[PDB]
Symmetry: D2
Subunit: 306 residues, 4 copies
Amino acid sequence: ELHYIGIDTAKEKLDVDVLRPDGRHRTKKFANTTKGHDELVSWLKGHKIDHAHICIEATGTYMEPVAECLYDAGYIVSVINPALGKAFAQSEGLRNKTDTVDARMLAEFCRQKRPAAWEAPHPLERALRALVVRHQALTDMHTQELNRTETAREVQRPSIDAHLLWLEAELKRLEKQIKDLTDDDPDMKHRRKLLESIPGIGEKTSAVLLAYIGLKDRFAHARQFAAFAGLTPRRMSKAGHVSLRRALYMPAMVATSKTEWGRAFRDRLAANGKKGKVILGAMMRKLAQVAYGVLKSGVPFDASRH
Amino acid sequence: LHYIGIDTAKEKLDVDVLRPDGRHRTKKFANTTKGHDELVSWLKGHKIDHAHICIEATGTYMEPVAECLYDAGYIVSVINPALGKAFAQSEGLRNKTDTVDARMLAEFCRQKRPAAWEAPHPLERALRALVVRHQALTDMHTQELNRTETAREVQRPSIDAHLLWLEAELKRLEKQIKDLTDDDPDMKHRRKLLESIPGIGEKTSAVLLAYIGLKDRFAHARQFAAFAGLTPRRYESGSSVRGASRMSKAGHVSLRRALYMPAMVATSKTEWGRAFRDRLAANGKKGKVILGAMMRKLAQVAYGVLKSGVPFDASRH
Amino acid sequence: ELHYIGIDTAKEKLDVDVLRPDGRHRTKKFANTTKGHDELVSWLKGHKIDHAHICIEATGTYMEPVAECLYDAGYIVSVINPALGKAFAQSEGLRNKTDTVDARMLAEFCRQKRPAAWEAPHPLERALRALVVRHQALTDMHTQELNRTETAREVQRPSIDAHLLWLEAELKRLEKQIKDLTDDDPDMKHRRKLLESIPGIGEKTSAVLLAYIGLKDRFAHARQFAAFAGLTPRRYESGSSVRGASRMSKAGHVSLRRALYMPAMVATSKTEWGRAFRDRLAANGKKGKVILGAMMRKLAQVAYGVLKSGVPFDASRH
Amino acid sequence: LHYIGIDTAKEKLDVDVLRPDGRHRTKKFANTTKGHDELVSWLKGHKIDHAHICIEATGTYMEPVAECLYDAGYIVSVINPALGKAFAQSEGLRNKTDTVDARMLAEFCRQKRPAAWEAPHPLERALRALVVRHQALTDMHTQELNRTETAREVQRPSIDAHLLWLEAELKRLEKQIKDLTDDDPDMKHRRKLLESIPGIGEKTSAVLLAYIGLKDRFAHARQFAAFAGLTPRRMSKAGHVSLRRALYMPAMVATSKTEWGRAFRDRLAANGKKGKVILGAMMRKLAQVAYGVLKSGVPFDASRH
RNA sequence: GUCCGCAUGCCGUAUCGGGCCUUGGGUUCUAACCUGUUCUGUAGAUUUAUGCAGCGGAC
RNA sequence: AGUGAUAAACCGGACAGUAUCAUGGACCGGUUUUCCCGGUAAUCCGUAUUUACAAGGCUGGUUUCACU
DNA sequence: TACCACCAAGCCGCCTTGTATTATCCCTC
DNA sequence: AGCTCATCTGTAGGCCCGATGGTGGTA
DNA sequence: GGCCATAAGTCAATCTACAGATGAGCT
DNA sequence: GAGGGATAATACAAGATACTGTTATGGCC
Ligand SMILES: [Mg+2]
């Protein structure tokens, strides 16, 4: 006795499809609102559905309320990468693509694949990643305006210089807001110190790594976390968080250039005859693994191991 | 019930059994009559009485082993290679640049539980073989036709000699097809029904029989249209993603190829065709769009007329 | 007597290649600095070169000072579209040494084609376009931060809301700076009112149009200004077989093309003469965006027409 | 001197004359033996007895009119169409029509002053035609060979019957080519020089001679390498594919089996070059050495390499 | 010999940007008609090849 | 930077192909959403040959070596 | 003790002209 | 003075150029 | 003097949902 | 009454798997 539910999410609506143990489908549309989420739970209890595994494609942040609602209702929620769903639909031989089809396709995804259960991240983890991605957003905007000074007309410059001062201030404000967040929590304070002990990783990179690694050891292996960033070869897969991947490139250079263990790594690969960026790609992968390793070890970085 | 996947190749087979408990027995074999008997014996050795084998439709290299296991007394499924690739990509994020392993096909078989494959009737195999040979030589004839336009004088003897040969051969095959369909009383009758449709003649009917077959495999005419890849492909999500509808093309190309000129003959110089054309033309559709739609219609009517078992009735349209 | 010079510009260094009437070359590289620009002029006068036609590629802000320098030093300066430059290099050979267009190639471009002479913009024209493109940059960033509010985390919202305020303030400030520019000059003040008289054009669109049309009427026909914005269809007819389909060329300033879209949408919807234009097109098998693309072209063409006429918009003419 | 630009079509012509004073004169003609005789007369109508005519290398529809005007007494230039298009994009940014292109070729002619086109010798034209036909039948013979691999048994009589026909025809042309060569004393000797190179045999010698021709129409051997599209820009590939493809198998036979070829392979292998990069390099070399050997007029000498 | 450890070797070309240039074609002929699908964006998801080598532990 | 010489050295990833596979979204009656059952030669959603085919064109960069 | 300067840097053919298929209807020997 | 509401499949080319972060080494 | 093997054989993340602009008539 | 010729359509994009031949020469018989 286990139902398999599939929810295709939109901004406004929720298309739901319940696959019963007998094999027949029940479907109903709902509003993607706090009210319409309570309507969904009531409609499941209406049909006497107590145990169910619910599958839902990671679709912006429109699925996040209902995923947490159904988790709290006491169901098994799985939030799948939508690339998998796309591939599954093709494997299921489906020609047309509609919302009703997708909700059914997700129900069958749930039954066949039996995906891993989804856990809502800790409030601190959610806060930290929010600040970190906001910080990258301002940096990008600061870089836009900093490029413009190069070829700016003299009537444009007062505006550009003014904007740069604002952006530089706001950037510092967040950096403190981040520091306050990690310093308050005893665990994050300690874990961040461990990351900064790695030569090549500083204030900025340590925050990014904590945002994606989290409080607890959610990864079982170092190579898993490296793969999660899209750093493991397939050429690099690039099948992982781009914000995590981009944050490691400049750490990789200062490591391979101005550290002992970095130059040691650089020279070894240089000997075998690797190009500059190939070595950097490799060092990005290594920094990721070492970062996860240092945290699980729970003791400062030790160069002797490398 | 065990689940087996076979990664077929020209020279080697690669086999992966999945036991009910969940352990993998694996062995490679030669893709030969000997190595097919080795497989059956190896399966029978490990006390594998009932199993569901899944094979990719790679080509003619997988056909003997599929027949061997069918005879041995197993459930053989022969899957569209695109489904296998898509399945591998649904199993992981980074399986794009990877082969579909025998293990993957066993998992495919367990999860999907695909339909059982049936070997075609020897007569159906012969017909489809002749029909695609006929298409092959038409293409070659067309090549040489195009060459006559801009030929040099020293080349023309060679091109003209080839054209004679190709026309003689095309004519020989057309008789060999006619003799095949006439000899069998079922095909003779079913062909006559297809030709009753206005827009469908001697060549198209042979192509339709080659893919419809003796038995009525398709439950609904809709499905035979989908089989040819002639149905539109909807692409809709939320209130933003709005992909324009287009011909799916996810079906037999040999079929889809054969229906275009019929569609053009239908919509142009036929009562029921013009009627269809005008209605869509009024609704504001392009010329080639109307043909694409008529192609789907002909396929759908072709199966409909056979399913009825009576000649084409214009009143129904 | 007339020499043909080509200058291949870079950030730091100039690369000059004189072509003599006889056919021999003179080559000398210079620094791309105020000193090196005066050094260039002296060097040309050194070799008794008073009459010459200089050809430079339009690569941005590194080639502007030297183009000014030579124009003032009494020479015919042509500033060519780099797309023309590359196409010329490919017409000279099939397997060219490099894909780059060197100074020698530019000297040759100048000789064979005798391109049109480049006139330096008026300080006010150059200032107005500077402010207008700055305004469009801040509008883009404002739109970025607007989109973010939709899906923002609550810890992020204070930062986004704060930025939006700054951007909105800056945009108001900059719009006033534009208004004060045009209202000071009696020429620009008059021309702006003539533009705004057109239904579907207001304060923002008028400034963009003035920025690209300028003080004087450089275009002979109004169709040419529509082409300058990249709003004219692109035909691809060849022989009998090769017949494609007409789409917008988009071969022109994006700043103009982006500025006219919402005006066109206002015109066809609310204004009488626009609605009239929409309907006649809509009668034929013409889709919504196709009508907008058409109205965009029309608005540009009317915008120029009105300024050339020198009298406010008159609905009777449409 | 007048600058005339002919835009060619299957049926019609679009002539555009540009006078020294700088005024256009347009007049259409039919692309026929009659309409070519009209053109000659109409030019002499406006007292044009000395002009440079520019026309795109467009199919074979411009071959008669080019031969006509060459015989009439004009400087005919037949330009690569890729150049023409590039020139059109250098003049403007917009629109592509027949009326534009006819006028455009007059401007091309004036500014560029392109090299004069010379009609091939009948034998050069015949040999090329046979060699081109021979490739067409080889490509068809391969199709039917591939088809035997996976053929059904009812198809197999048809495929085998076709192969026999194709093999008979290939053998026939190879003789027709050999007869053409052995008759002409020049081609007979020229081909013998080509075959003397280790790595070039019956097949390749005919292909090379088809594109080199009777006269030494290239100044240097490195020019002929460029004409095949074998020179690095990665290979440009800006040349005859028929000439290019013919050298790949000779290149393998050279680098693998011949003494001078192995030497070449080894030297690049020492520097650390990939398999196909060495083949790419040897293709260029065979082309260069082929032309060199003909210039010399002396059988291949290994010493030089 | 098997299984399990690994911040190990082998494999690895990051992510974002900025500025500037653009003087149609046909017609009943240039503020007319025919021909015309703007310019930019935003957010989220991603758990090993441990595949093969080493090195270590347990039985 | 020209001109002449070059069968040398450096720079070099050719072309053409073949076979095979493919059971719509839905609509119309029941049930009283879908699912499921029955029906579909009708209506709405369709730019064929998941690459249609043919012919033609293509006069190197540099380093040595001479002469300006 | 706060401030400055490096650290890495790949992409791979273009053009111009043409035409066939099949089945049904209409015209001529 | 303020608010709504008009469009919905995707497809121009070229040339000049810069930032990121975290060390070890300066003033 | 007629047959037969055989030399060569790189590629550049994937998805899923979403939004703004400007100017004129209306409120 | 039967056989041959002409016309209908025109912007293009977007699925997978398995596989082969070319030529010329030094090896064989
Ligand atoms: Mg969805």
